[PDB]
Amino acid sequence: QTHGESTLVNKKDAWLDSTKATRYLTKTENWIIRNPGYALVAVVLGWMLGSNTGQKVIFTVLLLLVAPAYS
Amino acid sequence: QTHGESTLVNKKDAWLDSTKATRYLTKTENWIIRNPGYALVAVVLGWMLGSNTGQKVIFTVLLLLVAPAYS
Amino acid sequence: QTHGESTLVNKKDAWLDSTKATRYLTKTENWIIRNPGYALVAVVLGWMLGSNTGQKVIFTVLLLLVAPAYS
Amino acid sequence: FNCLGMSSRDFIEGASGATWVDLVLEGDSCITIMAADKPTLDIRMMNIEATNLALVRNYCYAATVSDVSTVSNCPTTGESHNTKRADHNYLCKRGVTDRGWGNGCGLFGKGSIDTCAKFTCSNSAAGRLILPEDIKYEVGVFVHGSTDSTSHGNYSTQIGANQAVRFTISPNAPAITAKMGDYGEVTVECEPRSGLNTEAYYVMTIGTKHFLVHREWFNDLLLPWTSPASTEWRNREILVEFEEPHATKQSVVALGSQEGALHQALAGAIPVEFSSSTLKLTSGHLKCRVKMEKLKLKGTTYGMCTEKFTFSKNPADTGHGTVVLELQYTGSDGPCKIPISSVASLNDMTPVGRMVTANPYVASSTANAKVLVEIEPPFGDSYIVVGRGDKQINHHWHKEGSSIGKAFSTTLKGAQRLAALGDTAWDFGSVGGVFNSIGKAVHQVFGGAFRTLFGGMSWISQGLLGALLLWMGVNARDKSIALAFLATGGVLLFLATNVHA
Amino acid sequence: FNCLGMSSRDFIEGASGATWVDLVLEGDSCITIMAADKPTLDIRMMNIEATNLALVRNYCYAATVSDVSTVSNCPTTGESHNTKRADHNYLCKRGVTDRGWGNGCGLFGKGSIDTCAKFTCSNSAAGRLILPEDIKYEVGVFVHGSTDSTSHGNYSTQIGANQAVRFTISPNAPAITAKMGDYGEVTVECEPRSGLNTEAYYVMTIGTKHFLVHREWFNDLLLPWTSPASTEWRNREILVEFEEPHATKQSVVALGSQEGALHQALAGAIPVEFSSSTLKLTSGHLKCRVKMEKLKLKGTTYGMCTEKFTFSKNPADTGHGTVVLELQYTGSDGPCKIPISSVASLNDMTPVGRMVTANPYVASSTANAKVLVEIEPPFGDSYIVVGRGDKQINHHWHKEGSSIGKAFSTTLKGAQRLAALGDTAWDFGSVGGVFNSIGKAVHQVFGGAFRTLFGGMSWISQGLLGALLLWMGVNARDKSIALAFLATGGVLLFLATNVHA
Amino acid sequence: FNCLGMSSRDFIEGASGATWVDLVLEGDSCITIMAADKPTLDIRMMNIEATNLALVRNYCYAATVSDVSTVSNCPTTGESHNTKRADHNYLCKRGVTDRGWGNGCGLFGKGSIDTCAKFTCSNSAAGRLILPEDIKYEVGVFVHGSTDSTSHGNYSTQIGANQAVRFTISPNAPAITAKMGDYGEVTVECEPRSGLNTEAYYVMTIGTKHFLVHREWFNDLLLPWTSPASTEWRNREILVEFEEPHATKQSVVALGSQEGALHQALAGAIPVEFSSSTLKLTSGHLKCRVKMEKLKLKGTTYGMCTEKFTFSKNPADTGHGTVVLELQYTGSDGPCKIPISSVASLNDMTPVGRMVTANPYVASSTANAKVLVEIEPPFGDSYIVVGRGDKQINHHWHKEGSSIGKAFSTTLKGAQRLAALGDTAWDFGSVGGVFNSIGKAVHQVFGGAFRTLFGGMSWISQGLLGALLLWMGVNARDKSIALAFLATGGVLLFLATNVHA
Ligand SMILES: *[C@@H]1O[C@H](CO)[C@@H](O)[C@H](O)[C@H]1NC(C)=O
Ligand SMILES: *[C@@H]1O[C@H](CO)[C@@H](O)[C@H](O)[C@H]1NC(C)=O
Ligand SMILES: *[C@@H]1O[C@H](CO)[C@@H](O)[C@H](O)[C@H]1NC(C)=O
């Protein structure tokens, strides 16, 4: 489990500040690149049970986020 | 990124098999216990958005799973 | 990438004052002379792509400008 | 080799018309073939051996940082360049500080800064690639004859009796004809190259521990890696961090050894044994087509033994439905056939359970000779009658389970084998292939899409996706798509539960 | 101390007729206080010092395993129950291995095996807590007198001239009054214990590095931990792995280390300096109130000078909207006040730009003296005029800014301050009133709910949730619900972007 | 200095009530100030002189590769990593080639190869940054008096006559007063810092020719560029081409000198003069505020001349509507005032056209003296009458044009000045009126969006956009959008046609 952003006011950088924009995305992007075939699965699942187009997009993005970071 | 279950046919156990049922759930459960206040947020968001009871339950569990495992 | 007209107030002539009216046109005119067959394609696409008469002329001139200056 | 004391044991019936049998022969599992008239065969793949492994990448999991120097410039001038950047082995990263008149600069703003750190790697987790032309499967073949319990497993005694012979199956020798003294010769036409997919596995060594990782996983590690026989490292800014931009002197601290992170990352890796550049792992399978054309039962059959038989070891169930017992023959009548059978009751002496051992006999002519006998009694109460007349050793035996339970267990085992082998499972225990060929083709077609859509997804994710598919298919309108979604969800749930998580 | 060359600088103007002004006094954020007639005061909290810390736990990242012994039992004969399980400092795990006649047993099946290993931990990552009474701040106060730029930042010359002092704020010494040469006595009555909450922070010592981690995160680590001054390691099976259940033997292996996993896990941890049990961190905040009733000007008796002022150092921009210039007094007229002001043009010479260094004056009577001056020119072109007549020296300055741009930047900085500080941000630069108290109460009553709902959420998760809330609100039929969802989504998106990731 | 025979010379008439006017002082565009009674003076800034420039980026345009070597690796063996890659100034790039049995490899396929070439830069184009403080504009002020035509252009004579004087205007001294022998003092209040936007301009040096280029353009070039005082080049692959990947060897050739490409790329770059690190460009504008409070007449004490005046040189037009003539005095009565005026007709003898050279006279007492007089006759026929009686010498002049034509000409000139300046053009001749202030404010507001929306488009693209806007506006429905589009399109083509291309 990562520490996360400390609630203490710190105008300087934390222990890891360079990876602040990568720690939560490298795993997801590498998994998506690893098996890109799953991308269409989320799209079709959203289009099937999605009552509204916005709902379809929401379901697609939620599935594409759930699958890499398991649980 | 975890290695995951190997594609080889192994009758024996892998390098880590005792934690096979925990490596994907301990982080989520520890995060949920840490801030249980989010649990009602996902529940109400699913309930007030789903046009069907099953859809609402799906959205609730999807958000409650998205939150701990970022992306 | 060309430098373009400088924002500094200069009553003199810039580094290349003679070619100010040719740097942006010689390539296009050489290309359209070397490839006169594209003109019919451009006008046909412009006529088809628009319904209003003025829109057709705009489409034709825009495509005829696009083709020599790629992207 | 011998199947005695093996957790996984499967029996394949041998049709009289069929002369060849196709079996997967998966590692750490014993396959026993029970032919009608030919002696029973049991083949077990011991291990897979490889040699001459070549490096691919050398990830570093423990870095050392020292000799830190810092050069800074005024805000107006460009980014500073430290003189140590020209020399290699020095990780240099630029940065920005704040400069003022007190610091010595003539202007205020975001002054630049550059620092260096001598980067040295202590130990590296080198990865190696296994060439398909080097793997050497070791396969053992055994025929159940007259074997003592202590000798049932000792290869030297078995090869002395010309019953069990170990042969190494390599791409240069895919077929070996095993010669036996009296049972004939059994020929195997196994395909070693298609068995282990050496194009999708590395051999990652972390200190003393060796593993077997995938192609994609080992190439996606976020560690400073170098090419083989290369001093210069690449992507060194991972194990080394810079604490805070300080104009006077910036502190550079290296992260601790990532050895534990690698071990935690190797959740599903298969540990192997590496010594003197000799890989030796046991997992994997080789599709063998065993030809039992020349395999024959001994023509000469000896007379029944008449002396008293004593149980050296009482009948003990092996858990596969077969009973293993050892008989000590008190007399010395030379070669004779043991009068042992399994009967439903003492009233009817017709044997009801097939004998795994082919015509058990006392080969030795010396007294107190011990012979191991394996039987497969029928379900329910049964009697293991050894000998006949006034010397028969009647021994009651109760076998748990029923025919329906055995059928369900076999179906579950077949489903697990199909899940754990893919399309190759349709080639297990196949003799005709009239219906298995189309089954294998359709399974390949489905599996290609299944691995394309899902691929390497965790068991929990597979279970969640299967549950979602079931929920959205039970409410589906069209029957065809509903059935397809139900089947896909069932497959996902079975795969999730197959991991026993 | 001096706000010169500081990343963040805050300018506040004291309300007329107000004796005191409240300020949050952020760490490493020098704040300048300007009054109607009091000398300019800049207060900066240099660092926080704590002593006599106590341990709470001892997590282990490196473990050593030896003395591996195992005992095995026959199948269906109970568990092994190794004798070393009661023996402390021995980790034991029970597994199941298949046993047969080859292994020496009498029966067949999964025979239980219990393996015990000596768990010795080489290195421990001790965690400590900060006592609320031992934490003492260190606040430096300065008065903008006349000093050379070289000596402006040097503390020894300032403490010699009594223009700057360092005083410590402790729970039993909340109000400390510091006397100066002639400017008076500045009273600093602040609450130290209510500034930084030490009831939610731990000091974690991983080898040589030290960090300031949360209490909730430090107690949820999955590592072998013990209470202080004890060797009883609990939950220690994480660092020890049992390779494979083998007959009468089971080799066990421990993970090499866990420093890398810990360092990667300390994403947002705040590094601190720890030496001789004396904590020293430069971050944090301290809600402070400063009473300037006793503060008074110096040198107001002196008249204007009658010599030429020459710019020894060219004026420079601090980036916060204030220019810093250095003046050299050519004449020798003893102490005198410099007639320097910022005007919109030379024809009108009306003072429009406020001057940070209130009432500059040449201190020494030497022929050549250097005085540093800080001004706040108005937006657009402006002239820095020093005196009148033929002896005046003029300088032109054109700061890049606009009133609308200044307002937007101030709003953005205030929003960032509110996000970073929270409830205490409403007390920044506040002299009192009903508006500030009501705003602080509302902010507390909303931020409590916000933190309960979103306590450990990451910026990416916060951004996604904010986007989802906005998309739900734009589709919401109810006006009040839509407005509430829009506000919540905007707050979440702003907080996510505040991390700048 | 003087403005005889110079194009773009704009006369300005100060208000009688006012005594100070604001000018712009364009580059090589003199402006003559005509006061009601005060002597007319013209100020023209000569050049902008800077110094103490600092390097920012040293681009390279002349590569030279040598010592090319290659290392090839067999397929499925790893990357090559040529040993010379460790040394710097050795560009390396990895490629993939075809390997075979003839190439010496075991298993053939797609191999790996890398090539190392010693990259050395022969000629480097160095860019420099101008510090805003260092620029010191040079402004020359000339007062029209008794000046011979030959001595009018000589700077030494005017210094001797104490009429013209050169002073340098710098941010360290924006306001400087001029010394005249008898005309009093002239005080100007120019703003040098806001004159040239030195923050957005560099000084690029290509060989022996130096150019003043934009900030954004110079930072977006694609060439091997190094930080100042840094030997290590960066982005070197642009000037190096690897032609043929062959296992035996790979040919590396450096591209030709990019010196011509840069010159072709410098379309609107402004050439400058560089010597001893002293930038000298004559372009740019300097807003000023010239005060003539102390400016007084000379020669009013002299009496009128008695002898006859002969035209030494025929009157010649200037092109701006003024006439320059030279009068030769035959007698010798000491310093005397020349009676000269322009009359509409000879029966009136009433001066109708104001004289640019106010109060002409003959300073020298020599028998023959030459005096240059500049007049501004009205439109149509005009007579230049000198003296009266029998000694009167006449001359006819015909100023072709009309008041309406001159009105259109000055409107077009003002439009060009607005286009070439922006908001500073509203400070040309203003006396601080409210109309000019609001005009400049609204012009700044519009121009910010105009430059932000249309940053660096070429002249032809601006014309095309203006034509499209006109076509859309003439067919628009709503009146507001139609008029807005019409105005924007008109501005666009005015800008496109302003460059005269
Ligand atoms: C097999 O039997 C021979 C002869 O009794 C003995 O030397 C050998 O050690 C046995 N094999 C094993 C593995 O003990
Ligand atoms: C401060 O001043 C003292 C005496 O003037 C000098 O010895 C010391 O070096 C100075 N320190 C700094 C940091 O300038
Ligand atoms: C200008 O006057 C100087 C006298 O100082 C003389 O030497 C020179 O020839 C004159 N003419 C020019 C063009 O300089």
Author numbering:
A (entry chain b), B (entry chain a), C (entry chain c): 5 to 75
D (entry chain A), E (entry chain B), F (entry chain C): 1 to 501
What does the paper say about this structure?
Flaviviruses are positive-strand RNA viruses with enveloped virus particles. The E protein is responsible for attachment to target cells and mediates fusion between the viral and cellular membranes during entry. The C-terminal domain forms a stem consisting of three membrane-proximal helices (E-H1, E-H2 and E-H3) and two transmembrane helices (E-T1 and E-T2).
To demonstrate utility for resolving pathogenic flaviviruses, the structure of chimeric Murray Valley encephalitis virus (bMVEV) was determined at a resolution of 3.7 Å from a single dataset. Before cryo-EM analysis, the host restriction of bMVEV was assessed and confirmed to be similar to BinJV. MVEV has the highest fatality rate of mosquito-borne viruses endemic to Australasia34 and is thus too pathogenic to be imaged without inactivation at most cryo-EM facilities. Like WNVKUN, bMVEV has the typical structure of a flavivirus, where E folds into an ectodomain, a stem region, and two C-terminal transmembrane helices. Significant modelling differences exist in the stem region of E and the transmembrane domains of M and E between bMVEV and JEV. Given the high sequence similarity and consistency between the MVEV and WNVKUN structures, these differences are likely to result from ambiguous electron density at the lower resolution of 4.3 Å for the JEV structure. In bMVEV and bWNVKUN, Lys16 from M forms a salt bridge with Asp28 from the opposing E subunit, thus stabilizing the dimer formation. Re-examination of the WNVKUN, bWNVKUN and bMVEV maps, as well as deposited reconstructions of TBEV and ZIKV revealed unaccounted densities of similar shapes and volumes to the bDENV-2 map.
